[PDB]
């Protein structure tokens, strides 16, 4: 059991103890967002077109 | 200094927030109005405290935090509670109306109307620090906002602050106080599109603490006020190295296994008149047994790729040690072959704090350990079940595909944690 | 926040105009909207349904004068705002095709003119609750213009129905079952949220357990208030669980068309020892407790909230709700996980200190489709009354459409239970 | 009532626990994947041990120790009595034994092969007891319960396995009088039934013929194996604490040399029972097991707590 890294301060200590060795861009976000906010438009003109009918 | 900003998402990142930022001004004496008589450089400073509290003029000690739901009832209470004058209005984010425990309303439908509005709040808080660390950030995987939102911030925050450090405190969702039969989905969707984002996760499972609560507190019933302070002294342990004078490379050897196991003891009732005080030793032990664990699972049946306790109290290392050596030989605490088998250890001095008329006895010691054990796969495995009985009907599924998100998005996050799991099982068996 | 209340026809009315009596009580509101109470709990979510002393945000509907001069004159009549009363002279005679296309195409745009202003002063507009029967004209055949109309203007807020069933057993026409299978149609396509009171349950509800000879309109809107009462509460009070109508229907509605609810409410009522927890549990499960008449047993619940109101133990509501999941637990779908949801609120309703009330989604629904599907054929396939609809307009193609459309309904409820 | 679900269609033994238990009328059977149980008859590959006790309402017992593997397969066997200090590489009653990989010094490999040349290769125990008559080879095959609270029981019935063939000092090519087998025996039937001879006749033998007692000379030493291998896992397999309990029926086997010396040989986690003894067994199972832990003797308690 070896106890390495020993730090001391006034308010507390710190050790280790061994016992044993051994992103998408900005564009594709608004993109993506942009994608969604389309098939929702479409989905609701279906909607109304339906409802005009 | 190394600034640490949070960031509360959605009802339980927003009463977590309130826990925690309660719990740290009463362990660094700053009273309800920002006041603290103990600073005596007024302005500014270059303290450990200084890593979460900025200063004005004024003596005044602001938490570097944002919170945001996307409906303002529970950010309201924030804003005229017992905490209203310790943040700047604008840190207090609001929409109007709620992602209702659909992660696509809440990432994609109205996620999109305030994100810009988000990170410009946090741009100010960016630019109020020396050389930032980076971001907790507190949220649940079940709700709408919690999930969707947060999944979206994360994203762009990487765009935004690509060279800085996200880490997670979770949420994650038990029957016993959850509010959607959806929150499965919620999570899986979450969890895969925040994965290569974040740098590590704290998952506290709801059960977990509900029992602890139950268990050990007398607590009949518990409510998110009993949970949420068991929480933050979690919280509080996980970051006191930070706030303190002291000393994920230690935690998080491979990427995608960045989930470590809390630990935390001794939880003892407030109302128990007679308590014969555990030693280090003792509580030492209770950090590897299962029923003290923040996410129930069996260490004993996977591995471990790291440990770090952090001890609070009238704590020695000599007494640390000795517990240290007698668990090894008395524990299945079976390392993987590439790490060490060796504990990282903080102490810290000062007595650990109950916030007044709480549950939780005041004790001499305490400590919290953080393990990273492939055991914690178990919980990914219990909620990918719930998620296939679902999906396999496609229950529940026209509420996201209403919002724009496509069944792929589902099948493609549910294979991430097919993934996931084959990853955690490679490393453990 | 806000819902826009809407009540058509004779039976939408004098239901509609119950349910605001008995919440008006329990929020503290007096006829003359003025507050009286002694709880902070009662006007935390008051908006909801009352503008700011407060007025309901209630929409009166009606081809015929005479409801609307009862409801006026009725015990809260002053308490609604008098150019919310919409009304024209003609009626529609029990037919689904007067209130749908001839007559209450007349009136709607007036109407929708009253909902356009309600709507416009809200600060987030939920959506809209509709009281009405299915057996009549106004109600039916206008009231699901009504919804059609609502939609166009309002395409992404929740559409939420009340709608009385009908039964031979309390029968005002023989055309019921046309003008019901027509308006089904309807609310399959345009509503998000159905509660299904059935005629027929609170006939036999009256009659078999309450021990009525010859029940009342009064006597069966008595269980129906109480019900509208209970599965309202988490939209009117503080709470977690369902407290928004988009989050009820996340948490209710697993498949968009199967959106129809079996409420039931213990104790039935029409009280000198308050129920214990298991009993008002068992109770709110049993058949007898339904205001839809299916046997649960015939089928297999998708979905259940269950709201408990009164000062009790929490614990013991827990356990006692574990206990009739885990004993009966076949009766719940095993693919969907922790179906049933649980809220609790102190505030009881008047004259009981506790109760409960039930909201299912239950396959065994299907027993009321088919039994109005049944009644409906056996007419049609002699083509018989039809002329007092294709005399309004209509074609023989249309019902064929709507029978249709039920049987449908059925199917799918039936493949659910099978899965 | 009480619930169950049965994921081991093959399983012999809670093949007749869950018709045990029906014929009870306090116990329903669910179907196989609904999750409000209280008692799992589990399947013998992947049992979902970590869906287990996450049902609010439900006390869950499942009839399989995780980790228990450890101690049933003869790889990891080995490795357990080698590796754990409490058992040792000077363990007394363990044939001395060898983990190797693919791609008189008699031994045996484990399809089984035996040689005095070159999964397990393990020292081949030449001179064995022999019954008579026939100079005869047998194994004994004990039956151990573990409940949830790790009491340890010995089911007070066990079994010889026997050989019908005379016993073969220079011939290991041959098996069936090597190797004792139920199905690689099936000369069979001749002595005794199926070539099962039980625990009456056994002693009687052992007195009649060798002046002593199946207790004395045999039983003390299979009472010491299995106590030393279950008391050696029981940290790491015992569910005292966890959030579902765990029981397990195991078959231990036994070769006896002519010494009367008793030697392990394997244990075996999913084991089948001799056609007689099944309902006293499997009743048993449903007193001790189930029904302590759910409620509405045959077994000897292994317990020896010696003071030093
Ligand atoms: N521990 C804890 N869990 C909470 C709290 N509030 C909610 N939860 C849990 O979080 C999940 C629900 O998500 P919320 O955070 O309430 O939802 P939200 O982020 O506000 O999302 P929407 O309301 O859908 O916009 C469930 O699992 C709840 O049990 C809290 O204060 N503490
Ligand atoms: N070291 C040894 N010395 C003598 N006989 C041995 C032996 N190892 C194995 N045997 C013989 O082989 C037979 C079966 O061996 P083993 O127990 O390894 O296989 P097995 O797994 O098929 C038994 P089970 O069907 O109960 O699991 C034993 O009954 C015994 O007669
Ligand atoms: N429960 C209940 N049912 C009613 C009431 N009034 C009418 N009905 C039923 O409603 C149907 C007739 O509809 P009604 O509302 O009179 O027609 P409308 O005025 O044209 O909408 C029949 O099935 C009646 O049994 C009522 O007050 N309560
Ligand atoms: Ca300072
Ligand atoms: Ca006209
Ligand atoms: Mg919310
Ligand atoms: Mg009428």
């Given at each position: 059991?070896?106890?390495?890294?020993?730090?001391?301060?006034?308010?507390?200590?710190?050790?280790?103890?061994?016992?044993?060795?051994?992103?998408?861009?900005?564009?594709?976000?608004?993109?993506?967002?942009?994608?969604?906010?389309?098939?929702?438009?479409?989905?609701?003109?279906?909607?109304?077109?339906?409802?005009?009918? | 200094?190394?600034?640490?900003?949070?960031?509360?998402?959605?009802?339980?990142?927003?009463?977590?927030?309130?826990?925690?930022?309660?719990?740290?001004?009463?362990?660094?004496?700053?009273?309800?109005?920002?006041?603290?008589?103990?600073?005596?450089?007024?302005?500014?400073?270059?303290?450990?405290?200084?890593?979460?509290?900025?200063?004005?003029?004024?003596?005044?000690?602001?938490?570097?935090?944002?919170?945001?739901?996307?409906?303002?009832?529970?950010?309201?209470?924030?804003?005229?509670?017992?905490?209203?004058?310790?943040?700047?209005?604008?840190?207090?984010?609001?929409?109007?109306?709620?992602?209702?425990?659909?992660?696509?309303?809440?990432?994609?439908?109205?996620?999109?109307?305030?994100?810009?509005?988000?990170?410009?709040?946090?741009?100010?808080?960016?630019?109020?620090?020396?050389?930032?660390?980076?971001?907790?950030?507190?949220?649940?995987?079940?709700?709408?906002?919690?999930?969707?939102?947060?999944?979206?911030?994360?994203?762009?925050?990487?765009?935004?602050?690509?060279?800085?450090?996200?880490?997670?405190?979770?949420?994650?969702?038990?029957?016993?106080?959850?509010?959607?039969?959806?929150?499965?989905?919620?999570?899986?969707?979450?969890?895969?599109?925040?994965?290569?984002?974040?740098?590590?996760?704290?998952?506290?499972?709801?059960?977990?603490?509900?029992?602890?609560?139950?268990?050990?507190?007398?607590?009949?019933?518990?409510?998110?006020?009993?949970?949420?302070?068991?929480?933050?002294?979690?919280?509080?342990?996980?970051?006191?190295?930070?706030?303190?004078?002291?000393?994920?490379?230690?935690?998080?050897?491979?990427?995608?296994?960045?989930?470590?196991?809390?630990?935390?003891?001794?939880?003892?009732?407030?109302?128990?008149?007679?308590?014969?005080?555990?030693?280090?030793?003792?509580?030492?032990?209770?950090?590897?047994?299962?029923?003290?664990?923040?996410?129930?699972?069996?260490?004993?049946?996977?591995?471990?790729?790291?440990?770090?306790?952090?001890?609070?109290?009238?704590?020695?290392?000599?007494?640390?040690?000795?517990?240290?050596?007698?668990?090894?030989?008395?524990?299945?605490?079976?390392?993987?072959?590439?790490?060490?088998?060796?504990?990282?250890?903080?102490?810290?001095?000062?007595?650990?704090?109950?916030?007044?008329?709480?549950?939780?006895?005041?004790?001499?010691?305490?400590?919290?350990?953080?393990?990273?054990?492939?055991?914690?796969?178990?919980?990914?495995?219990?909620?990918?079940?719930?998620?296939?009985?679902?999906?396999?009907?496609?229950?529940?599924?026209?509420?996201?595909?209403?919002?724009?998100?496509?069944?792929?998005?589902?099948?493609?996050?549910?294979?991430?944690?097919?993934?996931?799991?084959?990853?955690?099982?490679?490393?453990?068996? | 926040?806000?819902?826009?209340?809407?009540?058509?026809?004779?039976?939408?009315?004098?239901?509609?105009?119950?349910?605001?009596?008995?919440?008006?009580?329990?929020?503290?509101?007096?006829?003359?909207?003025?507050?009286?109470?002694?709880?902070?709990?009662?006007?935390?979510?008051?908006?909801?349904?009352?503008?700011?002393?407060?007025?309901?945000?209630?929409?009166?509907?009606?081809?015929?004068?005479?409801?609307?001069?009862?409801?006026?004159?009725?015990?809260?009549?002053?308490?609604?705002?008098?150019?919310?009363?919409?009304?024209?002279?003609?009626?529609?005679?029990?037919?689904?095709?007067?209130?749908?296309?001839?007559?209450?195409?007349?009136?709607?745009?007036?109407?929708?003119?009253?909902?356009?202003?309600?709507?416009?002063?809200?600060?987030?507009?939920?959506?809209?609750?509709?009281?009405?029967?299915?057996?009549?004209?106004?109600?039916?055949?206008?009231?699901?213009?009504?919804?059609?109309?609502?939609?166009?203007?309002?395409?992404?807020?929740?559409?939420?129905?009340?709608?009385?069933?009908?039964?031979?057993?309390?029968?005002?026409?023989?055309?019921?079952?046309?003008?019901?299978?027509?308006?089904?149609?309807?609310?399959?396509?345009?509503?998000?949220?159905?509660?299904?009171?059935?005629?027929?349950?609170?006939?036999?509800?009256?009659?078999?357990?309450?021990?009525?000879?010859?029940?009342?309109?009064?006597?069966?809107?008595?269980?129906?208030?109480?019900?509208?009462?209970?599965?309202?509460?988490?939209?009117?009070?503080?709470?977690?669980?369902?407290?928004?109508?988009?989050?009820?229907?996340?948490?209710?509605?697993?498949?968009?068309?199967?959106?129809?609810?079996?409420?039931?409410?213990?104790?039935?009522?029409?009280?000198?020892?308050?129920?214990?927890?298991?009993?008002?549990?068992?109770?709110?499960?049993?058949?007898?407790?339904?205001?839809?008449?299916?046997?649960?047993?015939?089928?297999?619940?998708?979905?259940?909230?269950?709201?408990?109101?009164?000062?009790?133990?929490?614990?013991?509501?827990?356990?006692?709700?574990?206990?009739?999941?885990?004993?009966?637990?076949?009766?719940?779908?095993?693919?969907?996980?922790?179906?049933?949801?649980?809220?609790?609120?102190?505030?009881?309703?008047?004259?009981?200190?506790?109760?409960?009330?039930?909201?299912?989604?239950?396959?065994?629904?299907?027993?009321?489709?088919?039994?109005?599907?049944?009644?409906?054929?056996?007419?049609?396939?002699?083509?018989?009354?039809?002329?007092?609809?294709?005399?309004?307009?209509?074609?023989?193609?249309?019902?064929?459409?709507?029978?249709?459309?039920?049987?449908?309904?059925?199917?799918?409820?039936?493949?659910?239970?099978?899965? | 009532?009480?619930?169950?679900?049965?994921?081991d269609?093959n399983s012999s033994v809670y093949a007749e626990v869950s018709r045990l238990?029906?014929?009870?009328?306090?116990?329903?059977?669910?179907?196989?994947?609904?999750?409000?149980?209280?008692?799992?008859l589990?399947?013998?590959?992947?049992?979902?041990?970590?869906?287990?006790?996450?049902?609010?309402?439900?006390?869950?017992?499942?009839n399989?120790?995780?980790?228990?593997?450890?101690?049933?397969?003869?790889?990891?066997?080995?490795?357990?009595?080698?590796?754990?200090?409490?058992?040792?590489?000077?363990?007394?009653?363990?044939?001395?034994?060898?983990?190797?990989?693919?791609?008189?010094?008699?031994?045996?490999?484990?399809?089984?092969?035996?040689?005095?040349?070159?999964?397990?290769?393990?020292?081949?125990?030449?001179?064995?007891?022999?019954?008579?008559?026939?100079?005869?080879?047998?194994?004994?095959?004990?039956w151990?319960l573990?409940?949830?609270?790790?009491?340890?029981?010995?089911?007070?019935?066990?079994?010889?396995?026997?050989?019908?063939?005379?016993?073969?000092?220079?011939?290991?090519?041959?098996?069936?009088?090597?190797?004792?087998?139920?199905?690689?025996?099936?000369?069979?039937?001749?002595?005794?039934?199926?070539?099962?001879?039980?625990?009456?006749?056994?002693?009687?033998?052992?007195?009649?013929?060798?002046?002593?007692?199946?207790?004395?000379?045999?039983?003390?030493?299979?009472?010491?194996?299995?106590?030393?291998?279950?008391?050696?896992?029981?940290?790491?397999?015992?569910?005292?604490?966890?959030?579902?309990?765990?029981?397990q029926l195991?078959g231990?086997?036994?070769?006896?040399?002519?010494?009367?010396?008793?030697?392990?040989?394997?244990?075996?986690?999913a084991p089948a029972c001799a056609?007689?003894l099944y309902?006293?067994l499997c009743?048993?199972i449903?007193?001790?097991?189930?029904?302590?832990?759910?409620?509405?003797?045959?077994?000897?308690?292994?317990?020896?707590?010696?003071?030093?």
């Open positions: 059991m070896e106890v390495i890294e020993l730090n001391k301060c006034t308010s507390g200590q710190s050790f280790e103890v061994i016992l044993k060795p051994p992103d998408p861009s900005l564009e594709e976000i608004q993109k993506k967002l942009e994608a969604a906010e389309e098939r929702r438009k479409y989905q609701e003109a279906e909607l109304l077109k339906h409802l005009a009918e | 200094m190394r600034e640490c900003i949070s960031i509360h998402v959605g009802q339980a990142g927003v009463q977590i927030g309130n826990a925690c930022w309660e719990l740290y001004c009463l362990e660094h004496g700053i009273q309800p109005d920002g006041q603290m008589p103990s600073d005596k450089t007024i302005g500014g400073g270059d303290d450990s405290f200084n890593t979460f509290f900025s200063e004005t003029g004024a003596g005044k000690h602001v938490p570097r935090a944002v919170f945001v739901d996307l409906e303002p009832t529970v950010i309201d209470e924030v804003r005229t509670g017992t905490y209203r004058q310790l943040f700047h209005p604008e840190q207090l984010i609001t929409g109007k109306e709620d992602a209702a425990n659909n992660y696509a309303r809440g990432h994609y439908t109205i996620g999109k109307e305030i994100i810009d509005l988000v990170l410009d709040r946090i741009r100010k808080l960016a630019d109020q620090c020396t050389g930032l660390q980076g971001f907790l950030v507190f949220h649940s995987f079940g709700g709408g906002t919690g999930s969707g939102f947060t999944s979206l911030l994360m994203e762009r925050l990487s765009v935004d602050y690509g060279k800085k450090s996200k880490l997670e405190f979770s949420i994650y969702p038990a029957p016993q106080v959850s509010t959607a039969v959806v929150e499965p989905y919620n999570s899986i969707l979450t969890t895969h599109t925040t994965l290569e984002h974040s740098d590590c996760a704290f998952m506290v499972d709801n059960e977990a603490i509900y029992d602890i609560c139950r268990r050990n507190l007398d607590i009949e019933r518990p409510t998110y006020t009993n949970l949420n302070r068991l929480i933050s002294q979690i919280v509080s342990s996980i970051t006191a190295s930070l706030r303190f004078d002291g000393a994920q490379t230690n935690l998080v050897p491979y990427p995608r296994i960045h989930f470590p196991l809390a630990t935390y003891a001794p939880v003892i009732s407030a109302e128990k008149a007679y308590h014969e005080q555990l030693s280090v030793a003792e509580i030492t032990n209770a950090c590897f047994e299962p029923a003290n664990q923040m996410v129930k699972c069996d260490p004993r049946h996977g591995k471990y790729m790291a440990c770090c306790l952090l001890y609070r109290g009238d704590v020695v290392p000599k007494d640390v040690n000795a517990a240290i050596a007698t668990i090894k030989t008395k524990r299945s605490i079976q390392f993987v072959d590439w790490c060490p088998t060796g504990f990282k250890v903080g102490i810290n001095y000062q007595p650990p704090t109950v916030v007044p008329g709480g549950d939780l006895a005041k004790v001499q010691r305490a400590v919290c350990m953080l393990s990273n054990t492939t055991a914690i796969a178990e919980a990914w495995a219990r909620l990918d079940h719930k998620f296939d009985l679902m999906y396999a009907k496609r229950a529940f599924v026209h509420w996201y595909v209403g919002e724009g998100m496509e069944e792929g998005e589902f099948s493609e996050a549910r294979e991430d944690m097919a993934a996931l799991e084959k990853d955690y099982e490679e490393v453990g068996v | 926040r806000e819902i826009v209340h809407i009540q058509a026809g004779q039976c939408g009315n004098q239901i509609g105009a119950k349910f605001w009596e008995v919440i008006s009580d329990e929020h503290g509101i007096d006829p003359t909207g003025s507050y009286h109470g002694d709880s902070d709990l009662q006007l935390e979510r008051i908006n909801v349904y009352y503008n700011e002393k407060y007025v309901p945000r209630a929409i009166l509907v009606d081809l015929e004068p005479g409801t609307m001069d009862s409801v006026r004159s009725g015990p809260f009549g002053q308490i609604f705002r008098p150019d919310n009363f919409v009304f024209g002279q003609s009626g529609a005679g029990n037919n689904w095709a007067k209130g749908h296309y001839t007559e209450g195409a007349e009136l709607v745009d007036s109407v929708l003119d009253v909902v356009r202003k309600e709507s416009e002063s809200c600060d987030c507009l939920q959506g809209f609750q509709l009281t009405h029967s299915l057996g009549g004209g106004t109600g039916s055949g206008m009231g699901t213009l009504l919804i059609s109309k609502i939609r166009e203007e309002y395409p992404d807020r929740i559409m939420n129905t009340f709608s009385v069933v009908p039964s031979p057993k309390v029968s005002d026409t023989v055309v019921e079952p046309y003008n019901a299978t027509l308006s089904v149609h309807q609310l399959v396509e345009n509503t998000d949220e159905t509660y299904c009171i059935d005629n027929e349950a609170l006939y036999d509800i009256c009659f078999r357990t309450l021990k009525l000879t010859t029940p009342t309109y009064g006597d069966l809107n008595h269980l129906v208030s109480a019900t509208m009462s209970g599965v309202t509460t988490c939209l009117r009070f503080p709470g977690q669980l369902n407290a928004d109508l988009r989050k009820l229907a996340v948490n209710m509605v697993p498949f968009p068309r199967l959106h129809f609810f079996m409420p039931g409410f213990a104790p039935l009522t029409s009280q000198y020892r308050a129920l214990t927890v298991p009993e008002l549990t068992q109770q709110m499960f049993d058949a007898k407790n339904m205001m839809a008449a299916c046997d649960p047993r015939h089928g297999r619940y998708l979905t259940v909230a269950a709201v408990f109101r009164g000062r009790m133990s929490m614990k013991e509501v827990d356990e006692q709700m574990l206990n009739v999941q885990n004993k009966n637990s076949s009766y719940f779908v095993e693919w969907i996980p922790n179906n049933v949801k649980t809220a609790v609120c102190d505030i009881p309703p008047r004259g009981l200190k506790m109760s409960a009330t039930f909201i299912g989604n239950s396959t065994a629904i299907q027993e009321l489709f088919k039994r109005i599907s049944e009644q409906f054929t056996a007419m049609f396939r002699r083509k018989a009354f039809l002329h007092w609809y294709t005399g309004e307009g209509m074609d023989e193609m249309e019902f064929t459409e709507a029978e249709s459309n039920m049987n449908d309904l059925v199917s799918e409820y039936q493949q659910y239970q099978d899965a | 009532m009480y619930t169950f679900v049965v994921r269609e238990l029906l014929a009870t009328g306090q116990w329903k059977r669910l179907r196989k994947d609904n999750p409000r149980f209280n008692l799992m589990g399947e013998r590959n992947r049992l979902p041990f970590g869906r287990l006790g996450h049902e609010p309402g439900l006390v869950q017992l499942v399989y120790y995780r980790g228990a593997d450890k101690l049933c397969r003869k790889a990891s066997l080995v490795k357990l009595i080698k590796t754990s200090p409490e058992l040792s590489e000077s363990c007394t009653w363990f044939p001395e034994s060898y983990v190797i990989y693919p791609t008189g010094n008699v031994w045996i490999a484990k399809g089984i092969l035996i040689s005095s040349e070159a999964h397990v290769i393990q020292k081949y125990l030449e001179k064995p007891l022999l019954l008579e008559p026939g100079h005869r080879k047998f194994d004994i095959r004990s151990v573990v409940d949830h609270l790790y009491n340890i029981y010995l089911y007070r019935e066990g079994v010889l396995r026997t050989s019908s063939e005379p016993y073969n000092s220079a011939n290991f090519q041959d098996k069936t009088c090597h190797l004792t087998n139920h199905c690689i025996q099936k000369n069979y039937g001749r002595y005794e039934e199926g070539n099962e001879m039980f625990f009456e006749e056994f002693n009687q033998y052992l007195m009649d013929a060798l002046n002593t007692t199946l207790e004395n000379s045999i039983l003390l030493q299979i009472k010491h194996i299995i106590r030393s291998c279950l008391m050696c896992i029981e940290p790491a397999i015992s569910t005292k604490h966890l959030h579902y309990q765990s029981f195991f231990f086997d036994f070769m006896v040399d002519e010494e009367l010396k008793v030697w392990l040989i394997e244990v075996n986690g056609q007689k309902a006293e009743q048993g449903v007193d001790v097991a189930i029904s302590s832990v759910f409620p509405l003797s045959i077994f000897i308690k292994l317990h020896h707590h010696h003071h030093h």
